[PDB]
Amino acid sequence: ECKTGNGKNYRGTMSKTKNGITCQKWSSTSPHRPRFSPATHPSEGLEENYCRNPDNDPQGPWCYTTDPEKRYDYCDILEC
Ligand SMILES: NC[C@H]1CC[C@H](C(=O)O)CC1
């Protein structure tokens, strides 16, 4: 999928950050207990471990990481 703007409305399936590290799911609490999740941001498309922009950060989609000593990181979504 592609992103346009900040990718507020991005609903692709990228699952690794721009460093290629594997996301964590939005519905897991390991390795990280998330502040953003499907519970809380029901309208945010927080599916699977996919990159999303819940907070509309000018830096584009990110996800929680399966690196325990690294809480999140941004994903590299090509523009739209
Ligand atoms: N600026 C995106 C960023 C927002 C807070 C966050 C957290 O919930 O801990 C990590 C990612």
Coordinates of all heavy atoms in Angstrom, one line a residue:
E1 N 0.9 -1.2 0.0 CA 0.0 0.0 0.0 C 0.9 1.2 0.0 O 2.1 1.0 0.3 CB -0.9 0.0 1.3 CG -2.1 0.8 1.2 CD -2.5 0.8 -0.3 OE1 -1.7 0.1 -0.9 OE2 -3.4 1.6 -0.7
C2 N 0.4 2.4 -0.2 CA 1.2 3.7 -0.1 C 0.5 4.6 0.9 O -0.7 4.5 1.2 CB 1.3 4.4 -1.4 SG -0.2 4.6 -2.4
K3 N 1.3 5.6 1.3 CA 0.9 6.6 2.3 C 0.8 8.0 1.5 O 1.4 8.3 0.4 CB 1.8 6.9 3.4 CG 2.2 8.3 3.7 CD 3.7 8.6 3.5 CE 4.5 8.7 4.8 NZ 4.9 10.1 5.1
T4 N -0.1 8.8 2.0 CA -0.3 10.2 1.5 C -0.2 11.0 2.7 O -0.6 10.5 3.8 CB -1.4 10.2 0.5 OG1 -2.6 10.9 1.0 CG2 -1.8 8.7 0.0
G5 N 0.5 12.1 2.6 CA 0.7 13.0 3.8 C 1.5 12.2 4.8 O 2.5 11.6 4.5
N6 N 1.0 12.2 6.0 CA 1.6 11.6 7.2 C 1.1 10.1 7.3 O 1.7 9.4 8.1 CB 1.3 12.4 8.5 CG -0.1 12.0 9.2 OD1 -0.1 11.5 10.3 ND2 -1.2 12.3 8.4
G7 N 0.1 9.8 6.5 CA -0.4 8.4 6.4 C -1.2 8.1 7.7 O -1.2 7.0 8.3
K8 N -2.0 9.2 7.9 CA -3.1 9.2 9.0 C -4.1 8.1 8.6 O -4.6 7.3 9.4 CB -3.8 10.5 9.0 CG -3.5 11.2 10.4 CD -3.6 10.1 11.5 CE -4.8 10.2 12.4 NZ -4.9 9.1 13.4
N9 N -4.3 8.2 7.3 CA -5.3 7.2 6.7 C -4.7 6.0 6.1 O -5.4 5.2 5.4 CB -6.2 8.1 5.9 CG -7.2 8.9 6.9 OD1 -7.5 10.1 6.6 ND2 -7.6 8.2 7.9
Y10 N -3.4 5.8 6.4 CA -2.7 4.6 5.8 C -3.3 3.2 6.3 O -3.1 3.0 7.5 CB -1.2 4.6 6.0 CG -0.5 3.4 5.5 CD1 -0.3 3.1 4.1 CD2 0.0 2.5 6.4 CE1 0.3 1.9 3.7 CE2 0.7 1.4 6.0 CZ 1.0 1.2 4.7 OH 1.7 0.0 4.3
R11 N -3.7 2.4 5.4 CA -4.1 1.1 5.8 C -3.5 -0.1 5.0 O -4.0 -1.2 4.8 CB -5.6 1.0 5.9 CG -6.4 1.6 7.1 CD -5.8 1.3 8.4 NE -5.1 2.5 9.0 CZ -5.8 3.7 9.2 NH1 -7.1 3.9 9.0 NH2 -5.0 4.8 9.6
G12 N -2.1 0.0 4.9 CA -1.3 -1.0 4.2 C -1.0 -2.1 5.3 O -1.6 -2.3 6.3
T13 N 0.0 -2.9 4.9 CA 0.4 -4.1 5.7 C 1.9 -4.0 5.9 O 2.4 -5.1 6.1 CB -0.1 -5.4 5.1 OG1 0.6 -5.7 3.8 CG2 -1.6 -5.6 4.9
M14 N 2.6 -2.9 5.9 CA 4.0 -2.9 6.2 C 4.2 -3.4 7.7 O 3.4 -2.9 8.6 CB 4.6 -1.5 6.0 CG 5.9 -1.4 5.1 SD 7.2 -2.6 5.5 CE 8.1 -1.6 6.7
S15 N 5.0 -4.3 8.0 CA 5.2 -4.9 9.3 C 6.6 -4.8 9.8 O 7.0 -5.4 10.9 CB 4.8 -6.3 9.3 OG 5.2 -7.3 8.4
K16 N 7.5 -4.0 9.2 CA 8.8 -3.9 9.8 C 9.1 -2.4 9.7 O 8.5 -1.8 8.8 CB 9.9 -4.7 9.1 CG 10.3 -5.9 10.0 CD 11.1 -6.9 9.2 CE 10.6 -6.9 7.7 NZ 9.6 -8.0 7.6
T17 N 9.8 -1.8 10.6 CA 10.2 -0.3 10.6 C 11.1 0.0 9.4 O 11.6 -0.9 8.7 CB 10.8 0.1 11.9 OG1 11.8 -1.0 12.0 CG2 10.0 0.1 13.1
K18 N 11.6 1.2 9.5 CA 12.5 1.6 8.3 C 13.9 1.0 8.5 O 14.6 0.7 7.5 CB 12.5 3.2 8.2 CG 13.6 3.8 9.1 CD 13.2 4.3 10.5 CE 14.1 5.4 10.9 NZ 15.2 5.0 11.8
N19 N 14.1 0.3 9.7 CA 15.3 -0.4 10.0 C 15.1 -1.9 9.7 O 16.0 -2.7 10.1 CB 15.8 -0.2 11.5 CG 16.3 1.2 11.7 OD1 15.6 2.1 11.9 ND2 17.6 1.3 11.4
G20 N 14.0 -2.2 9.2 CA 13.6 -3.6 8.9 C 13.3 -4.5 10.1 O 13.2 -5.7 9.9
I21 N 13.2 -4.0 11.3 CA 12.8 -4.7 12.5 C 11.2 -5.0 12.5 O 10.5 -4.0 12.1 CB 13.0 -4.1 13.9 CG1 12.3 -5.1 14.9 CG2 12.4 -2.6 13.9 CD1 12.6 -5.0 16.4
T22 N 11.0 -6.2 13.0 CA 9.6 -6.7 13.0 C 8.7 -6.0 14.1 O 9.1 -5.9 15.2 CB 9.5 -8.2 13.3 OG1 9.7 -8.9 12.1 CG2 8.1 -8.6 13.9
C23 N 7.6 -5.5 13.6 CA 6.7 -4.9 14.6 C 6.3 -5.9 15.7 O 6.9 -6.9 16.0 CB 5.5 -4.4 13.8 SG 6.0 -3.0 12.7
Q24 N 5.5 -5.4 16.6 CA 4.8 -6.0 17.7 C 3.3 -5.8 17.3 O 3.1 -4.8 16.4 CB 4.9 -5.3 19.1 CG 4.6 -6.2 20.3 CD 4.6 -5.2 21.5 OE1 5.7 -5.1 22.1 NE2 3.5 -4.5 21.8
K25 N 2.4 -6.6 17.8 CA 1.0 -6.3 17.4 C 0.4 -5.2 18.3 O 0.9 -5.0 19.5 CB 0.1 -7.6 17.5 CG 0.8 -8.8 16.8 CD -0.2 -9.4 15.8 CE 0.4 -10.6 15.1 NZ 0.9 -11.7 16.0
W26 N -0.6 -4.5 17.8 CA -1.2 -3.4 18.6 C -1.9 -4.0 19.8 O -2.0 -3.2 20.8 CB -2.0 -2.6 17.7 CG -1.2 -2.0 16.5 CD1 -1.1 -2.5 15.3 CD2 -0.3 -0.8 16.6 NE1 -0.4 -1.6 14.5 CE2 0.2 -0.6 15.3 CE3 0.1 0.1 17.6 CZ2 0.9 0.5 14.9 CZ3 0.8 1.2 17.2 CH2 1.2 1.4 15.9
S27 N -2.3 -5.3 19.7 CA -3.1 -6.0 20.7 C -2.2 -6.8 21.6 O -2.8 -7.6 22.4 CB -4.3 -6.7 20.0 OG -3.9 -7.9 19.2
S28 N -0.9 -6.7 21.5 CA -0.1 -7.5 22.5 C 0.4 -6.4 23.5 O 0.2 -5.2 23.3 CB 1.1 -8.2 21.8 OG 1.9 -8.8 22.8
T29 N 1.0 -6.8 24.5 CA 1.5 -6.1 25.7 C 2.9 -6.6 25.9 O 3.4 -6.4 27.1 CB 0.6 -6.3 26.9 OG1 0.9 -7.5 27.6 CG2 -0.9 -6.2 26.6
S30 N 3.5 -7.2 24.9 CA 4.8 -7.7 24.9 C 5.4 -7.6 23.5 O 4.7 -7.9 22.5 CB 5.0 -9.1 25.5 OG 6.2 -9.7 25.4
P31 N 6.7 -7.3 23.4 CA 7.6 -7.0 24.4 C 7.4 -5.7 25.2 O 8.1 -5.4 26.1 CB 9.0 -6.8 23.8 CG 8.7 -6.7 22.3 CD 7.3 -7.1 22.0
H32 N 6.4 -4.9 24.6 CA 6.0 -3.6 25.1 C 4.5 -3.5 25.4 O 3.6 -4.1 24.8 CB 6.3 -2.5 24.0 CG 7.7 -2.3 23.8 ND1 8.4 -2.5 22.6 CD2 8.6 -1.8 24.7 CE1 9.7 -2.4 22.9 NE2 9.9 -1.9 24.1
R33 N 4.3 -2.8 26.5 CA 2.8 -2.6 26.8 C 2.5 -1.2 26.2 O 3.0 -0.2 26.6 CB 2.3 -2.9 28.2 CG 1.1 -3.8 28.0 CD 0.0 -3.5 29.0 NE 0.2 -3.8 30.4 CZ 0.2 -4.9 31.1 NH1 -0.1 -6.1 30.5 NH2 0.5 -5.0 32.4
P34 N 1.6 -1.3 25.2 CA 1.3 -0.1 24.4 C 0.4 0.9 24.9 O -0.6 0.5 25.6 CB 0.7 -0.6 23.0 CG 0.6 -2.1 23.2 CD 1.1 -2.5 24.6
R35 N 0.7 2.2 24.6 CA -0.2 3.3 24.9 C -1.3 3.4 23.8 O -2.3 4.0 24.1 CB 0.5 4.5 25.3 CG 0.7 4.5 26.9 CD 1.5 5.7 27.3 NE 2.9 5.5 26.8 CZ 3.9 6.4 26.9 NH1 3.7 7.5 27.6 NH2 5.0 6.2 26.3
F36 N -0.9 3.0 22.6 CA -1.9 3.1 21.5 C -2.2 1.6 21.2 O -1.2 0.8 21.1 CB -1.6 3.9 20.3 CG -1.5 5.4 20.4 CD1 -0.4 6.0 21.1 CD2 -2.5 6.2 19.8 CE1 -0.4 7.4 21.2 CE2 -2.4 7.6 19.9 CZ -1.3 8.2 20.6
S37 N -3.5 1.3 21.0 CA -4.1 0.0 20.8 C -5.6 0.1 20.4 O -6.2 1.1 20.3 CB -4.0 -0.8 22.1 OG -5.3 -0.8 22.7
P38 N -6.0 -1.1 19.9 CA -7.4 -1.2 19.3 C -8.4 -0.9 20.4 O -9.6 -0.5 20.3 CB -7.4 -2.5 18.7 CG -6.2 -3.2 19.0 CD -5.3 -2.3 19.9
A39 N -8.1 -1.2 21.7 CA -9.0 -0.9 22.8 C -9.5 0.6 22.8 O -10.6 1.0 22.9 CB -8.3 -1.2 24.1
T40 N -8.5 1.5 22.8 CA -8.3 2.9 23.0 C -8.5 3.7 21.7 O -9.0 4.9 21.8 CB -6.9 3.2 23.5 OG1 -6.6 2.5 24.8 CG2 -6.5 4.7 23.8
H41 N -8.0 3.1 20.6 CA -8.2 3.9 19.4 C -8.8 3.1 18.3 O -8.3 2.7 17.3 CB -6.9 4.8 18.9 CG -6.1 5.4 20.0 ND1 -5.6 4.7 21.1 CD2 -5.9 6.7 20.2 CE1 -5.0 5.5 21.9 NE2 -5.2 6.8 21.5
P42 N -10.1 2.8 18.8 CA -10.9 1.9 18.0 C -10.9 2.4 16.5 O -10.9 1.5 15.7 CB -12.3 1.9 18.6 CG -12.1 2.6 19.9 CD -10.7 3.2 20.0
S43 N -10.8 3.7 16.2 CA -10.9 4.1 14.8 C -9.6 4.1 14.0 O -9.6 4.4 12.8 CB -11.7 5.4 14.8 OG -13.1 5.1 14.9
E44 N -8.6 3.7 14.7 CA -7.2 3.9 14.2 C -6.7 2.7 13.3 O -5.6 3.0 12.8 CB -6.3 4.2 15.4 CG -6.2 5.6 15.8 CD -7.2 6.6 15.3 OE1 -7.3 7.0 14.1 OE2 -7.9 7.1 16.2
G45 N -7.4 1.6 13.0 CA -7.0 0.6 12.1 C -5.8 -0.2 12.7 O -4.9 -0.8 12.1
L46 N -5.7 -0.2 14.0 CA -4.6 -0.8 14.7 C -4.6 -2.4 14.6 O -4.7 -3.1 15.6 CB -4.4 -0.4 16.2 CG -3.5 0.8 16.6 CD1 -3.3 1.8 15.3 CD2 -4.2 1.7 17.7
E47 N -4.5 -2.8 13.3 CA -4.5 -4.3 13.1 C -3.2 -5.0 12.9 O -2.3 -4.7 12.1 CB -5.2 -4.6 11.7 CG -5.0 -3.4 10.8 CD -6.1 -3.4 9.7 OE1 -6.5 -4.5 9.4 OE2 -6.4 -2.2 9.3
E48 N -3.2 -6.2 13.5 CA -1.9 -7.1 13.3 C -0.7 -6.3 13.8 O -0.9 -5.7 14.9 CB -1.7 -7.5 11.9 CG -1.7 -9.0 11.6 CD -2.9 -9.8 12.0 OE1 -3.9 -9.2 11.7 OE2 -2.8 -10.8 12.8
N49 N 0.4 -6.3 13.2 CA 1.6 -5.6 13.8 C 1.9 -4.4 12.8 O 2.9 -3.7 13.0 CB 2.7 -6.6 14.1 CG 3.2 -7.2 12.7 OD1 2.5 -7.2 11.7 ND2 4.4 -7.7 12.7
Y50 N 1.0 -4.2 11.9 CA 1.1 -3.2 10.8 C 1.4 -1.8 11.3 O 0.6 -1.3 12.2 CB -0.2 -3.2 9.9 CG -0.7 -4.5 9.4 CD1 -2.0 -4.6 8.9 CD2 0.2 -5.6 9.2 CE1 -2.4 -5.7 8.3 CE2 -0.3 -6.8 8.7 CZ -1.6 -6.9 8.2 OH -2.1 -8.0 7.6
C51 N 2.2 -1.1 10.5 CA 2.6 0.3 10.7 C 1.3 1.3 10.6 O 0.6 1.2 9.6 CB 3.7 0.7 9.7 SG 5.1 -0.4 10.0
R52 N 1.1 2.1 11.6 CA 0.0 3.1 11.6 C 0.5 4.3 12.3 O 1.5 4.3 13.1 CB -1.3 2.5 12.2 CG -1.8 1.3 11.4 CD -2.5 1.7 10.1 NE -3.3 0.6 9.7 CZ -2.8 -0.4 9.0 NH1 -1.6 -0.2 8.5 NH2 -3.3 -1.6 8.5
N53 N -0.2 5.4 12.1 CA 0.0 6.8 12.6 C -1.2 7.3 13.4 O -2.0 8.1 13.1 CB 0.3 7.6 11.3 CG 1.0 8.9 11.9 OD1 1.3 8.7 13.1 ND2 1.4 9.8 11.1
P54 N -1.3 6.6 14.5 CA -2.4 6.9 15.5 C -2.5 8.3 15.9 O -3.6 8.9 16.0 CB -2.2 6.0 16.7 CG -0.9 5.2 16.4 CD -0.5 5.5 15.0
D55 N -1.3 8.9 16.2 CA -1.1 10.3 16.7 C -0.9 11.3 15.6 O -0.7 12.5 16.0 CB -0.1 10.3 17.7 CG 1.2 9.7 17.3 OD1 1.2 8.9 16.3 OD2 2.2 9.9 18.0
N56 N -0.9 10.9 14.3 CA -0.6 11.8 13.2 C 0.7 12.6 13.2 O 0.8 13.8 12.9 CB -1.9 12.6 13.1 CG -1.5 13.8 12.3 OD1 -1.0 14.7 13.0 ND2 -1.8 13.9 11.0
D57 N 1.7 11.9 13.7 CA 3.1 12.4 13.8 C 3.6 12.8 12.4 O 3.4 12.1 11.4 CB 3.9 11.2 14.4 CG 5.4 11.4 14.6 OD1 6.1 12.2 14.0 OD2 6.0 10.6 15.4
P58 N 4.2 14.0 12.3 CA 4.7 14.3 10.9 C 5.7 13.3 10.4 O 6.0 13.4 9.2 CB 5.4 15.7 11.2 CG 5.2 16.1 12.6 CD 4.6 14.9 13.4
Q59 N 6.3 12.5 11.2 CA 7.2 11.4 10.7 C 6.6 10.2 10.1 O 7.5 9.4 9.6 CB 8.3 11.0 11.7 CG 9.2 12.3 12.0 CD 10.4 11.9 12.7 OE1 11.4 11.5 12.0 NE2 10.5 11.8 14.1
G60 N 5.3 10.0 9.9 CA 4.7 8.9 9.2 C 4.6 7.6 10.0 O 5.4 7.5 11.0
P61 N 3.8 6.6 9.6 CA 3.7 5.3 10.2 C 5.0 4.7 10.9 O 6.1 4.8 10.4 CB 3.3 4.3 9.1 CG 2.8 5.1 8.0 CD 3.1 6.6 8.3
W62 N 4.7 4.1 12.0 CA 5.6 3.5 13.0 C 4.8 2.3 13.6 O 3.6 2.2 13.3 CB 6.0 4.6 14.0 CG 4.8 5.1 14.8 CD1 4.1 6.2 14.6 CD2 4.2 4.4 15.9 NE1 3.2 6.4 15.6 CE2 3.2 5.3 16.4 CE3 4.5 3.3 16.7 CZ2 2.3 5.0 17.5 CZ3 3.8 3.1 17.9 CH2 2.7 3.9 18.3
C63 N 5.5 1.6 14.5 CA 4.8 0.5 15.2 C 5.6 0.2 16.5 O 6.8 0.7 16.5 CB 4.8 -0.7 14.3 SG 6.4 -1.5 14.0
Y64 N 5.1 -0.6 17.4 CA 5.9 -1.0 18.6 C 6.7 -2.2 17.9 O 6.2 -2.9 17.0 CB 5.2 -1.4 19.9 CG 4.3 -0.2 20.5 CD1 3.0 0.0 20.0 CD2 4.9 0.7 21.3 CE1 2.2 1.1 20.5 CE2 4.2 1.8 21.8 CZ 2.9 2.0 21.4 OH 2.2 3.1 21.9
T65 N 7.9 -2.4 18.3 CA 9.0 -3.2 17.9 C 9.2 -4.5 18.8 O 8.9 -4.5 20.1 CB 10.4 -2.4 18.1 OG1 10.7 -1.8 16.8 CG2 11.6 -3.0 18.8
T66 N 9.6 -5.5 18.1 CA 9.9 -6.8 18.8 C 11.4 -6.7 19.3 O 11.9 -7.7 19.9 CB 9.6 -8.0 17.9 OG1 10.5 -7.9 16.8 CG2 8.1 -8.2 17.7
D67 N 11.9 -5.5 19.2 CA 13.2 -5.3 19.9 C 12.8 -4.8 21.3 O 12.1 -3.8 21.4 CB 14.2 -4.4 19.1 CG 15.5 -4.1 19.9 OD1 15.6 -4.8 20.9 OD2 16.2 -3.1 19.6
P68 N 13.1 -5.6 22.4 CA 12.8 -5.2 23.7 C 13.5 -3.9 24.1 O 12.7 -3.0 24.6 CB 13.1 -6.4 24.6 CG 13.9 -7.3 23.7 CD 13.9 -6.8 22.3
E69 N 14.8 -3.7 23.9 CA 15.4 -2.4 24.2 C 15.1 -1.2 23.3 O 15.7 -0.1 23.5 CB 16.9 -2.4 24.5 CG 17.4 -3.4 25.5 CD 17.0 -4.8 25.2 OE1 16.6 -4.9 24.0 OE2 16.9 -5.8 25.9
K70 N 14.1 -1.4 22.5 CA 13.6 -0.4 21.5 C 12.1 -0.3 21.4 O 11.4 -1.0 20.6 CB 14.2 -0.9 20.2 CG 13.6 -0.5 19.0 CD 13.5 1.1 19.0 CE 13.5 1.4 17.5 NZ 14.5 0.4 16.9
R71 N 11.4 0.6 22.1 CA 10.0 0.7 22.2 C 9.2 0.9 20.8 O 8.2 0.1 20.6 CB 9.4 1.6 23.4 CG 7.9 1.9 23.2 CD 7.4 3.1 24.0 NE 6.8 2.5 25.3 CZ 5.6 2.0 25.3 NH1 4.7 2.6 24.4 NH2 5.1 1.4 26.3
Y72 N 9.6 1.8 20.0 CA 9.0 1.9 18.7 C 10.1 2.3 17.7 O 11.3 2.3 18.1 CB 7.7 2.9 18.5 CG 8.0 4.3 18.8 CD1 8.2 5.2 17.8 CD2 8.5 4.7 20.1 CE1 8.6 6.5 18.0 CE2 8.9 6.0 20.3 CZ 8.9 6.9 19.3 OH 9.2 8.3 19.5
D73 N 9.6 2.7 16.5 CA 10.5 3.2 15.4 C 9.5 3.4 14.2 O 8.4 2.7 14.2 CB 11.7 2.3 15.1 CG 12.7 2.9 14.2 OD1 12.4 4.0 13.6 OD2 13.8 2.4 14.1
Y74 N 9.9 4.2 13.3 CA 9.1 4.4 12.1 C 9.5 3.4 11.0 O 10.5 2.6 11.1 CB 9.1 5.9 11.6 CG 8.9 6.9 12.6 CD1 9.8 7.0 13.7 CD2 7.8 7.7 12.7 CE1 9.7 8.0 14.7 CE2 7.7 8.8 13.6 CZ 8.6 8.9 14.6 OH 8.5 9.8 15.7
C75 N 8.5 3.2 10.2 CA 8.4 2.3 9.0 C 8.5 3.3 7.8 O 8.3 4.5 7.9 CB 7.0 1.6 9.0 SG 6.6 0.8 10.6
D76 N 9.0 2.7 6.7 CA 9.3 3.3 5.5 C 8.3 3.0 4.4 O 8.4 2.0 3.6 CB 10.7 2.7 5.0 CG 11.5 3.9 4.5 OD1 11.0 4.8 3.9 OD2 12.8 3.8 4.8
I77 N 7.3 3.9 4.4 CA 6.1 3.7 3.5 C 6.4 4.7 2.4 O 6.8 5.8 2.7 CB 4.8 3.8 4.3 CG1 4.7 2.6 5.3 CG2 3.5 3.8 3.3 CD1 6.0 2.1 6.0
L78 N 6.3 4.2 1.2 CA 6.5 4.9 0.0 C 5.3 5.9 -0.2 O 4.1 5.5 0.2 CB 6.8 3.9 -1.1 CG 8.2 3.2 -0.8 CD1 8.0 2.3 0.5 CD2 8.6 2.2 -1.9
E79 N 5.5 7.1 -0.7 CA 4.4 8.0 -0.9 C 3.4 7.8 -2.0 O 3.5 7.2 -3.1 CB 4.8 9.5 -0.9 CG 4.6 10.2 0.5 CD 3.2 10.8 0.7 OE1 2.7 11.7 0.1 OE2 2.6 10.2 1.7
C80 N 2.3 8.4 -1.6 CA 1.0 8.4 -2.2 C 0.4 9.8 -2.2 O 0.3 10.4 -3.3 CB 0.3 7.4 -1.3 SG -1.0 6.4 -1.9
Ligands
LIG1 N1 5.1 9.9 18.2 C1 4.6 8.5 18.0 C2 4.8 7.9 19.5 C3 3.7 8.3 20.4 C4 3.8 7.8 21.8 C5 4.2 6.4 21.8 C6 3.9 5.6 23.0 O1 2.6 5.3 23.1 O2 4.6 5.2 23.9 C7 5.3 5.9 20.9 C8 5.2 6.5 19.5

